[PDB]
């Protein structure tokens, strides 16, 4: 066999045009070249997003497990988009409260669902300028109301 690809000492172009135009089936490269991050992906292709807790939701999870997950619909500040953020740890949406500024994070999965929370791609971090883990563990205290 010749093994598909050309092998000439002067091929090059038919390699370099081929590898431009196969790469395009590499999903890493496609998002980078087409700015899905910027044009979509609620956060503007950004680590985080401050966004106002529009309501404390309970989201009934996917199968095997069964639990209502205690989330928060957010309104991302910059974009004006609305997303749904998870609130980690026992209760702690109690600590989130209502109509707070809430800083969000990606859940981990480069978009996508983290585990069983269907349609939630974000974790709360800072509620009105603290940190949920600092509240939950109570090493730090909330700045009053």
């Amino acid at each position: 066999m010749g093994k598909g690809k050309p092998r000439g000492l002067n091929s090059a172009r038919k390699l370099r045009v081929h590898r431009r135009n196969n790469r395009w089936a590499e999903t890493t490269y496609k998002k980078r070249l087409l700015g899905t991050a910027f044009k979509s992906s609620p956060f503007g292709g950004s680590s985080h997003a401050k966004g106002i807790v529009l309501e404390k939701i309970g989201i009934e999870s996917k199968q095997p497990n069964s639990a209502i997950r205690k989330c928060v619909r957010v309104q991302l500040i910059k974009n004006g988009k609305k997303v749904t953020a998870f609130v980690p740890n026992d209760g702690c949406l109690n600590f989130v409260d209502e109509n707070d500024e809430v800083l969000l994070a990606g859940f981990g999965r480069k978009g996508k669902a983290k585990g069983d929370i269907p349609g939630v791609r974000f974790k709360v971090v800072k509620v009105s300028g603290v940190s949920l883990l600092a509240l939950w563990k109570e090493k730090k205290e909330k700045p009053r109301s």
Binding site: K50, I52, Q75, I77, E98, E101, S145
Partner: protein, 165 residues
């Protein structure tokens, strides 16, 4: 978001103004007279928020009650097949609710000691007083659920999903 942050930026301007949140989920602005509040809400929409303020006067409230104990007689069924539940409603005396408001009686109090106070001081059956779980809605507030009856095997699981419901 531009409102909320401006709203906070107003509350610090004038010594009087309090920018609290209603219990039915509505922003509120306090104002010593009513002139002052038209000045604040002129200043807030410009300057501080810099955004047009859609105004209303309040919400507010309100709590219902139950008034008269019916002791009768509605019965359940959720979906089919299912079980059943039952119904009644009180209300318990306002002396009890006052303590649940004040935080003398608590959700995180001793089951036996709280129940003995309920039966003696506030008019209750001591067994029924132990058999209450919740002080809805949810942790605090003067609504209750009580378990009377005898028999029926697996009440303990649904007892919690009754409380939760």
């Amino acid at each position: 978001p531009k409102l909320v942050e401006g709203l906070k930026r107003l509350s610090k301007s004038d010594p009087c103004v309090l920018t609290y949140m209603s219990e039915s989920g509505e922003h509120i602005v306090a104002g010593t007279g009513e002139l002052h509040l038209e000045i604040c809400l002129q200043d807030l929409e410009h300057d501080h928020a810099g955004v047009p303020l859609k105004i209303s006067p309040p919400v507010v409230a309100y709590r219902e009650t139950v008034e008269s104990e019916s002791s009768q007689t509605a019965l359940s069924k959720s979906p089919n097949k299912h079980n059943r539940i039952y119904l009644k409603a009180e209300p318990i005396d306002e002396e009890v609710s006052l303590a649940i408001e004040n935080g003398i009686i608590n959700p995180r109090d001793d089951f036996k000691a709280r129940a003995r106070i309920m039966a003696d001081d506030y008019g209750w059956d001591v067994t029924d007083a132990r058999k209450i779980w919740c002080f809805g809605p949810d942790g605090n507030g003067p609504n209750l659920v009580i378990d009377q009856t005898k028999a029926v095997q697996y009440l303990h699981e649904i007892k919690d999903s009754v409380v939760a419901a």
